[PDB]
Amino acid sequence: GGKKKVCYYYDGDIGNYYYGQGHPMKPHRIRMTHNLLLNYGLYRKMEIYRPHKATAEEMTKYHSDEYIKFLRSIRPDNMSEYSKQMQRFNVGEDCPVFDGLFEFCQLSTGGSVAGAVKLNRQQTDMAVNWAGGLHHAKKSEASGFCYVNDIVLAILELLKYHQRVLYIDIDIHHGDGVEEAFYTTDRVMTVSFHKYGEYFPGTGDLRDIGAGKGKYYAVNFPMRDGIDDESYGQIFKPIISKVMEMYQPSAVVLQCGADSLSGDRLGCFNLTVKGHAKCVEVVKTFNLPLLMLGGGGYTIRNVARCWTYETAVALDCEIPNELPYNDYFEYFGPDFKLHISPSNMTNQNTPEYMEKIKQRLFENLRMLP
Numbered sequence: 001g002g003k004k005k006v007c008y009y010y011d012g013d014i015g016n017y018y019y020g021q022g023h024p025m026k027p028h029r030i031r032m033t034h035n036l037l038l039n040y041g042l043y044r045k046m047e048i049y050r051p052h053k054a055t056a057e058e059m060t061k062y063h064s065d066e067y068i069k070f071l072r073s074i075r076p077d078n079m080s081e082y083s084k085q086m087q088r089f090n091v092g093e094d095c096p097v098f099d100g101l102f103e104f105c106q107l108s109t110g111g112s113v114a115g116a117v118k119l120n121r122q123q124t125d126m127a128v129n130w131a132g133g134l135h136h137a138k139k140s141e142a143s144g145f146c147y148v149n150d151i152v153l154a155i156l157e158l159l160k161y162h163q164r165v166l167y168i169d170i171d172i173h174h175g176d177g178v179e180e181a182f183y184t185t186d187r188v189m190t191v192s193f194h195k196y197g198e199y200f201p202g203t204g205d206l207r208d209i210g211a212g213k214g215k216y217y218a219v220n221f222p223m224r225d226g227i228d229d230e231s232y233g234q235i236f237k238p239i240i241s242k243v244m245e246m247y248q249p250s251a252v253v254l255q256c257g258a259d260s261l262s263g264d265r266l267g268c269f270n271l272t273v274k275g276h277a278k279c280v281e282v283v284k285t286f287n288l289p290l291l292m293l294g295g296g297g298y299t300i301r302n303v304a305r306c307w308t309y310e311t312a313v314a315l316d317c318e319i320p321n322e323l324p325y326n327d328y329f330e331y332f333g334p335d336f337k338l339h340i341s342p343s344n345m346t347n348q349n350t351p352e353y354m355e356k357i358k359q360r361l362f363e364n365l366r367m368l369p
């Protein structure tokens with residue numbers, strides 16, 4: 001038990017990176033989050049750090065030299081000279097070239113790796129990097145609005161001092177890049193809950209369980225549209241409890257993508273902020289070194305609410321439902337409250353479906369040593 005020491009990573013410049021006209025990914029949401037939680041007074045209870053800019057050396061602990069050289073070189077003014085490389089590395093459409101792209105990667109990654117170092121040094125219990133969580137980036141390829149996989153880099157940092165690391169992903173999308181990086185090792189178990197079926201990235205079937213020494217160390221919980229707080233709560237705690245019991249990790253990384261909330265512009269789930277944050281509460285109870293990361297999230301008022309509340313949860317600090325005045329106060333109308341209501345959308349995940357998938361995953365977890 002007990003309240004935990006929390007270190008939080010933020011760079012004020014993050015909100016100025018712009019993916020381009022009409023692109024749904026808005027780094028500004030991280031600044032909105034920051035401003036809201038400062039206005040609730042949460043800075044009084046945690047240490048706030050500005051991350052360093054991760055170097056090419058740091059990024060090539062996972063990514064290829066050629067891919068990182070390309071990301072460090074490509075700019076809107078020289079794009080026409082790089083048309084071949086852009087296609088090779090899947091940059092230029094979903095993952096656009098924007099001003100300051102590499103610096104955005106460096107700040108996103110720096111927070112996650114800095115948090116992992118702090119955890120390794122036993123100087124904090126929890127580290128938070130809401131600018132992180134870019135779970136789709138691959139060794140030599142951008143994907144899913146992600147360029148550099150800060151998560152994989154942070155886990156590699158943790159593996160210097162931790163024999164077994166658990167990765168949990170509650171973003172609505174499958175954490176495919178993290179899963180791929182660790183698919184053939186038992187030193188990282190990856191557990192993703194996600195919408196599955198005619199949905200990005202197309203991976204994360206129940207039957208994808210890892211390979212080689214990593215067989216049984218990837219866990220995928222495929223879901224349908226409309227999952228609600230009750231349905232999610234009923235499987236998350238039992239799955240994570242069984243994973244904790246069987247895998248016995250010494251550190252945890254939790255990707256908290258807010259695109260699994262009700263009303264998300266790109267998502268199709270029906271979780272409230274309380275339902276999402278219940279996941280952070282469950283993981284926190286195991287009293288392991290914990291790195292909490294961001295992720296997707298497209299209805300930006302709800303992203304700010306979600307990550308503010310989850311910061312409060314990390315701190316065991318009760319905050320009022322009445323939102324404090326802040327620099328983005330108009331974004332939180334018409335109610336100006338912290339918590340959200342679910343919609344009346346149909347939950348396609350029947351209780352029987354949820355129990356059945358849970359039972360199939362428990363069968364796989366029985367195969368751990």
Ligand SMILES: [NH3+][C@H](CCc1ccccc1)C(=O)N1CCCC1
Nearest residue numbers: 133134144145146173200295296
């Ligand atoms: N979870 C992913 C986005 C990952 C991400 C990218 C950049 C910064 C932070 C998090 C998502 O929502 N996507 C929508 C379709 C393509 C991927």
Ligand SMILES: [Ca+2]
Nearest residue numbers: 169171173193
């Ligand atoms: Ca997920």
Ligand code: NA
Nearest residue numbers: 182185188217
């Ligand atoms: Na693995």
Ligand SMILES: [Zn+2]
Nearest residue numbers: 171173259296
């Ligand atoms: Zn997502």
